[PDB]
Design a binder for these strands. Sequence first.
RNA 1: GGGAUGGCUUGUGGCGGCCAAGCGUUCAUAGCGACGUCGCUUUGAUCCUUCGAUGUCGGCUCUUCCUAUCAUACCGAAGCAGAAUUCGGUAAGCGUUGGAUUGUUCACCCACUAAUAGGGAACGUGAGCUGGGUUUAGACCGUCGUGAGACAGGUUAGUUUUACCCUACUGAUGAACUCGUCGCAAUGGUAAUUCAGCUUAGUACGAGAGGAACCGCUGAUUCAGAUAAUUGGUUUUU
RNA 2: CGCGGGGUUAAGGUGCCGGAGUGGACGCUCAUCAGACACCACAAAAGGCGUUAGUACAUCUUGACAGCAGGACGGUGGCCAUGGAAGUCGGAAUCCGCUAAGGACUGUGUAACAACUCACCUGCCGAAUGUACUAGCCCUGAAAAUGGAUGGCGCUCAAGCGU
Lengths: 97, 135, 79, 254, 237, 169, 190, 67
Amino acid sequence: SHRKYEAPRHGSLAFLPRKRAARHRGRVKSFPKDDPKKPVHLTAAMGYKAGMTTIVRDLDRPGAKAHKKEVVEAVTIIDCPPMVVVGLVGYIETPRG
Amino acid sequence: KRGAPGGKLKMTLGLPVGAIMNCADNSGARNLYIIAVKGAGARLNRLPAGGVGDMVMATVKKGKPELRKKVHPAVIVRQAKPWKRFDGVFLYFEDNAGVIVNPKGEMKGSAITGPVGKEAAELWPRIASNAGVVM
Amino acid sequence: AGTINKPKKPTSKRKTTRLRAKISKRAAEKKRKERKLARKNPEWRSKLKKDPGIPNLFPYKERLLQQIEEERIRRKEEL
Amino acid sequence: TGWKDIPPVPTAQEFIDIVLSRTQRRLPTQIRPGFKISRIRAFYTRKVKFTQETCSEKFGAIISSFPVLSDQHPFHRDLMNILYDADHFKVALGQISTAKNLIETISRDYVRLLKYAQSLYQCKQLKRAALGRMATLIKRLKDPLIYLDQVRQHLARLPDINPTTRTLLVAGFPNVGKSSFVRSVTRADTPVEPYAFTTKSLFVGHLDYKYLRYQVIDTPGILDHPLEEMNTIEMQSVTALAHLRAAVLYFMDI
Amino acid sequence: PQNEYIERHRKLHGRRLDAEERARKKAAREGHKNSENAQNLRGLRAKLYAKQRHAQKIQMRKAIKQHEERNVPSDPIPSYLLDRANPTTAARFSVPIPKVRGISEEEMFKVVKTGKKTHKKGWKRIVTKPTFVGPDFTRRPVKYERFIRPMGLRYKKANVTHPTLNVTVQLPILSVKKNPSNPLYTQLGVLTKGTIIEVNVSDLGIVTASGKIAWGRYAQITNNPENDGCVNAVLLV
Amino acid sequence: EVPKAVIEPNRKWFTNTRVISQDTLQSFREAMAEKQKDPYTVLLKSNKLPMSLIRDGPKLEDGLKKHQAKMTIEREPFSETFGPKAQRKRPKLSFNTVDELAGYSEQSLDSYHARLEEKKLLSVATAKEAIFNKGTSKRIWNELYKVIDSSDVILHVLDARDPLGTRCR
Amino acid sequence: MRYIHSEETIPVPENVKVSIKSRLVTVEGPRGKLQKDLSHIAVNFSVVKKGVIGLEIHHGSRKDVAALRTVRTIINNMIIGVTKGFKYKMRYVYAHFPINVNVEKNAETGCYEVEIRNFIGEKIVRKVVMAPGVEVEISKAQKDELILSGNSLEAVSQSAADIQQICKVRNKDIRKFLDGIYVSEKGNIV
Amino acid sequence: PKSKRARVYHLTQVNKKGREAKERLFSNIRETIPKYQHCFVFSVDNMRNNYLKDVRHELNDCRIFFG
RNA sequence: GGGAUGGCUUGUGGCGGCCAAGCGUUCAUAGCGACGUCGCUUUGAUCCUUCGAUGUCGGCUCUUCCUAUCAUACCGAAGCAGAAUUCGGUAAGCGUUGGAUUGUUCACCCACUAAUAGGGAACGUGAGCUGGGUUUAGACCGUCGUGAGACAGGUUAGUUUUACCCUACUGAUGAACUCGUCGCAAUGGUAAUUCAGCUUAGUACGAGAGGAACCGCUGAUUCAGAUAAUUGGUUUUU
RNA sequence: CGCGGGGUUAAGGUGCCGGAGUGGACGCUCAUCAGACACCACAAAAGGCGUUAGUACAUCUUGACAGCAGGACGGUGGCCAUGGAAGUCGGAAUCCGCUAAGGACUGUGUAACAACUCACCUGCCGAAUGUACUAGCCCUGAAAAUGGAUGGCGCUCAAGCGU
Ligand SMILES: [Mg+2]
């Protein structure tokens, strides 16, 4: 018989399986769609998470209650030493991807 | 229009259904017993709860006998559970207290004892007009 | 209806033995009951059924009517 | 306020279709002969009770929405009698309340019988009997429902006349300029034409004098014959003149 | 706005500029639309649509036949009875229903179980059909009540039709004369199909040949009250 | 076992079971008129009578009131009163002269103000507690009607401190 | 029943050139070129006579015979388009808020664009792109009138229908709110 | 042909004439021939012809057929 | 020792009379008969008429499915002015709550809310936990019985106690292809939701009372995935 | 019905799974889950502007059916009623003239009129039509709840249906 009181299911099935990731370094599944009329640029970078701290921001958000006021916000610091470019990979399009 | 006011930032809700808080006005009531919170959503087993600036529905347990037989709208003006404002300040009052209003936000009483919160004062102009101290 | 994009549960055309046997039994019982009702039918029935006649679009219908006249005249003359 | 919040009154056949489609669609329909007899009884008892509850809600809405003539100011009571016959008004609402009560009695009787029914076939027959008797009772209400729906539309379009405020009542014979005066001093859209009885209902406009709101009532014309020979159109003006404490402006064309 | 304001708006400003064209085109598409409904609607909605279309076709045929025939009371009553709603009014002493379905004791009576043990006593019987208990009825004490005739199934009146006068009146039941299945059913007063009951016919105004008023007669039950929730009977005249 | 349910042909089915004479009816009507009520007498066995031919008829005011609505509808149907095919032109009035209309409006206003004052003399409220519904349960009233059906004598018990308060009319 | 032979004919004016190859019909006139692919319909084309196109179906059912009437009218409409043209006049009306209609020609795409503003006081700007080959002009003879003209009747009438459907009143009584843009005249340019 | 235009049965008083009108016209003309000295033919091409009523009224001794 | 009705059902009563297109019948003019109709089953009342457990349901947690749609989205119609709605269509994507009441068929009340829709997967017997139908042995009262005892009944207290197996499910390793780095993507899963406020605008509309919407802007509800700067909590940092 | 070899069949089959025909003849059918082992129920004298084959009655070069151009009139604003009411809110009557034909009116419309429209008639046109039934095949003719079944693939001048 039917469930007497409705409730949404616990957790999202979109993030299955809840297994360990196959690699320590994160994988860019998708890069931005390429427009050849734009100038050449890089789409990504790497860094190392160092920790978190607090800032005070002078907010300019018209319509918001905190407009023209100071807001305290949490931030994350990522240590980013420069990357070194060492290679070039070419990709072709096939009916298998 | 229902009792829930718009433009209210998220805060820690300190008063669930069943809480008894002080009455900060001179309407004759001494305390207010929360039976419902305006604008509360739907979730299984979750008690509805309100914070400072929220309109609740309350009954009077101590006070004048004429106020005992009705369900009054009330606005929470002070809470003891600590909450954070957008300037990073965590703060709390030394009691939980509210004032009886009508659905339009106008007060039943004519004076407020003690301070009121900035949230309640900003959301309800009659409370702001009847407050002596705003903290 | 949104049948093409979201079809429902299909209606099976595969029969079960139980339903086939039950349908056969009900059909046989209906045949017996209809025979009994025809045997006890009180509705009036004609001794001779009404003939449709000759179709109008038959091109030699008038010739057939002439032959019918000639046959009945010959029969009356012989009798 | 007015009478625009009266819900629409369906015809008898529409009422039957609405109630039976609610019963068909808002309740489960599949019950099996092999189930327990208490389960079968519960199924058919719920069908009968839900049908009666829908009928009661709709009839009660009709009764509670229409005005009570006995509770009105004498102007509105007399005007309502002029526009719709007061006997017919009370008779139609009385038939509605009587049908509502009879439908509840039928529901109680058949629920009591379904407590003792012993098979799915008997339960089904008793359910169908209850629903059919309710439908027969509703089908007997064909003329009152049509009349009440017409009355509802006219009541929704009636002007709001406050009987205890500052009011100017414009009266007189036809074709003397009553609607012309009302158009010249207010914003009301009461038509002006050269033929008699251009205005066939009361119209109201409003004005401000010394920061005070006044209401002005344009009326149909009145002819010179006694009250027994007056039709409903002239009797609207007679009702306004008799029951509204106002300043009367009697217009004459010399 | 007040009074007939949409009619006045139509008088002053007209309608939308494409209104007549759109109405004419929709009325022209009604034939295809009705065929599409006839072939594509499903279920109960389809059944109600087909039944209601059947009713339209019959009414249209009647109107057409009457228009073709444009170019072409029953019993004598006095003048004071003219224009009133009058009834149409249409040895072997056999009843109209000489035979009905027999009711077994298993169908008539259900076992009422008593006791607190898992195995229960079963001597009490409840009557599952409508009954007539007669006047001044007091139920037996529960320790000595074998036959239970529940109050919700007790009836006092019946809708009796007179075959000759063609009228139906609600009449009090006087007694149960003969239930055809069992004399025990007669004694319990069970009202099923084919049962002979005695009814009060005072409302019918029957006078005998000697001038006495006949207020008690016999009727036969013509329906199944356990299925209908009412008692229907025909007077035996 | 299914029995044979058959009604035999019989002349008794087509005769009158109970007849009464006009003199007997008149005597019973006189008994109706002279009947008086005594608390110290009880009814032991009712006499089977055609009481609709014996009891006094309804009062004429109720008899005319009970048919006034159907009379008004038969005289003036709903579709002729209001609606697109309505033919009603003359209203029904409680007055005949302008002077009577003035007096009628005065009395109507007085009665309207009196009813308003009576209603005035006579935040939403909290719900009535369910404890004050005790004694009105369907189970309790089923028990009561079972006891009434089973009992010959009914002892209605009254608190002496409040007899009419505890009386169950 | 299958009909052995069925035939329709299309007359062609003197200034028109018609070329049909594998049921792809090209019609040439003073006003330009129109093309239409009719390979979804079984038909045999021929030149029966000087200035007359013949259309025929062999061994066809009643439906296939009937389809030639549609083919005939379609080709006749292309011929009328390259000779006289097609013109749809639309009128926009309002009660309180004046409808503002602005017409531009996109140089990149070649299509006309119609921007509609202040439709019952709404703040959104409605934008309709015309079909290629349809010209839109604001009239100077009459008040609040647009004129859509072209060679393709389908392109002109569909552009007019898109303008008609973009200005739809929603959630209001349409006996009362009469604002909109409506097709008021249909005809030929010449 | 299941797909067909539904024919409107008219609930109006006047029916189609038929061959009875043709025979009545024949008999009326052939009965008016021997009573008159002259038979003119007149034409009214692309005209409203509601003024033939007034012509018939004016020429009350003559007989006009417009069939 | 033996056991543990089902391509059912759904929305429109029964009996009696009449009419009836048609079906039959036309050496008998009977009989069947849809659509209908007519009889039985308070001037908006009364509140001083609640009519029998042999049949048992629940609650918690949690998942999924149906659509017979309560809300949210789009659409058709209505004196639908506006506002608020009502009737209907497509639609199950997404939600569908918190309490009171056991001197009882626990069903109805109260409130919040966008809304507080209805069902199945058990109840066509049936090992998750735990309350009622419910019922071993102790005991009391009522009814019956001479009694043992039984029951119209009412009350109180009361023993079942796996998992380490196979499968399923959730995670975790892994042989063979030298080891490793960077990738591709078949297939499977899939995600957001609702409300309010500002502006539009006291504008369209309206006699008046009242009173919207599109574009634009800002928060909040429910859900989901992370995180620990800050604030609380936690302390064997013993 | 013993154990074997060869030959031939029955019921059922021959597009693939599967041995044997994408076999032959003439037709019918297009289904938003067709149909293929149906007869019973749903279910009716049922609903279809699906598609064919028929039966009956009827119109038609004296011009049918569809249209387009025009007529659609006079007694008369017929009687009663209505504040008003003229074919068109109602009640009841519903005739005559001129006629080629035209209702004491079929709808829209007006406060009432007006104006428009339909019935009916004429001109143009040009050859076949209309209506009601009958028989086939097709669609609808009620369905719940894990994902599934003409046995599966799949099949559309069939690999469906009749011979
Ligand atoms: Mg005037």
